[PDB]
């Protein structure tokens, strides 16, 4: 019943090879719908879902200039963080950013997000109240003081409470056939004498999946991380060394528990 | 839709 919109940004400095690589993607729930890659001949925000192609040219011109401005700012921040951490200009470094909003069945805001990461570790994050920051080190405290002086959180809070959920309600109504309709998985059990039993779940959306005589063997179970099939569906399996498998999903009418049919 | 913001670190 809940929904979300998210934007992921990644800037990786390439010393001696030119400007950093900037890749950003946008998601509505687990459905990709926009992308931007700086390593394109004419870099521009591009559609990745059928329901976003309806947007006019003023949508794409604006989203493209937001990505071009975000890459520009991340280029400055990569050089700025070299000053903060006293690092060499010859080393590659990564800047990851993620922001978005969650809504419920009414379309009202549940939780807003905006968090940074420098070289795989947290940098600065907007707290749940959308008015304060949490810095992970003294370098992010420099950024926090600048972002508090410039009242950055007051615009991010205005976006997460306003434009973010308003954009989200629009995407849910346009692509309702593919976004507001879940798909249950196809299940089967295989046997591999060593012996092992593999409980499969294929072709389901969204990616949220959960896999003797009613008890759980949570420690002797090898659960591979959910993987995308490629057609906007997902896959996942679980193996136990030898006994029944447990399966739940949103699209499933009731939680099925399967057994190995010889 | 993305947010229009320029916030250097």
């Amino acid at each position: 019943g809940s929904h979300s919109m998210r934007y992921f940004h990644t800037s990786v400095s390439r010393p001696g090879r030119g400007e950093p690589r900037f890749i950003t993607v946008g998601y509505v729930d687990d459905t990709l719908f926009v992308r931007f890659d700086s390593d394109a001949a004419s870099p521009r925000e591009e559609p990745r879902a059928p329901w976003i192609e309806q947007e006019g040219p003023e949508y794409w011109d604006r989203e493209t200039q937001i990505s071009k401005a975000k890459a520009q700012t991340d280029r400055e921040d990569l050089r700025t963080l070299l000053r903060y951490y006293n690092q060499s200009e010859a080393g590659s470094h990564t800047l990851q950013n993620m922001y978005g909003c969650d809504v419920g069945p009414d379309g009202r805001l549940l939780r807003g997000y905006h968090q940074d990461a420098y070289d795989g570790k947290d940098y600065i994050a907007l707290n749940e109240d959308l008015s304060s920051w949490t810095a992970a080190d003294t370098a992010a405290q420099i950024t926090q003081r600048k972002w508090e002086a410039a009242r950055v959180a007051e615009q991010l809070r205005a976006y997460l409470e306003g434009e973010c959920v308003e954009w989200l309600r629009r995407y849910l109504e346009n692509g309702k056939e593919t976004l507001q309709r879940a798909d249950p998985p196809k299940t089967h059990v295989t046997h591999h004498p060593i012996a092992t039993l593999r409980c499969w779940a294929l072709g389901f959306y969204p990616a949220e999946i959960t896999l003797r005589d009613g008890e759980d063997q949570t420690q002797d179970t090898e659960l591979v991380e959910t993987r995308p099939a490629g057609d906007r569906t997902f896959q996942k399996w679980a193996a136990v060394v030898v006994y029944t498998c447990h399966v739940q999903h949103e699209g499933l009418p009731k939680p099925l528990t399967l057994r190995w049919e010889p | 839709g993305q947010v229009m913001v320029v916030a250097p670190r």
Partner: T-cell receptor
Amino acid sequence: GVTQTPKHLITATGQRVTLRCSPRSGDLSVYWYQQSLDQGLQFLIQYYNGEERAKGNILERFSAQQFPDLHSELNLSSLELGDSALYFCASSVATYSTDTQYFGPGTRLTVLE
Amino acid sequence: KQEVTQIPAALSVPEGENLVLNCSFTDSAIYNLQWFRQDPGKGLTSLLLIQSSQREQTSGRLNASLDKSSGRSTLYIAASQPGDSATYLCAVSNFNKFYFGSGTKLNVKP
């Protein structure tokens, strides 16, 4: 606050004038504007940490820069009668879209035949 | 490009009157909308800064609104005072540069 020199400037056609600006201490970004009656307040150029960041409808005869001490300079060469206007200088802490600019008193230029 | 228009051009009112100063912009992809006051000899002074995703800002007797979907902004001045006499400039910030409006020359009569 932002200070601009000189306060006034009377000049003739073909002459050249240099306008100066000291941004607020700590401000990294400087802005230059031109305010006339026919065009109003027009944005000319913006510098950030010494590098040109934005450009309005600045003319080729208009030259500007930001020095390492963060103070700026605006040269108006081959002056014409239409250059008679008020030239303002603004400064901001950085390039934040959530923060404001801080303007100086301005320099009034009058070009005569 | 971006065209910023302001209504009205001038305004001579008796003191204590509530004022409505309007601003219109054609490009809605803006980072912020500011309301400046310009005084002869002192320069521009920012009164309010409405963020990109904000719909209104408030500072004492000043209360400005923002509607990007229509490209509108309105600076409300409650209980106008003679000290408020100045040119009120609507400023907008776009991807490329900043744009200003014609301005509203205000004169509050004591």
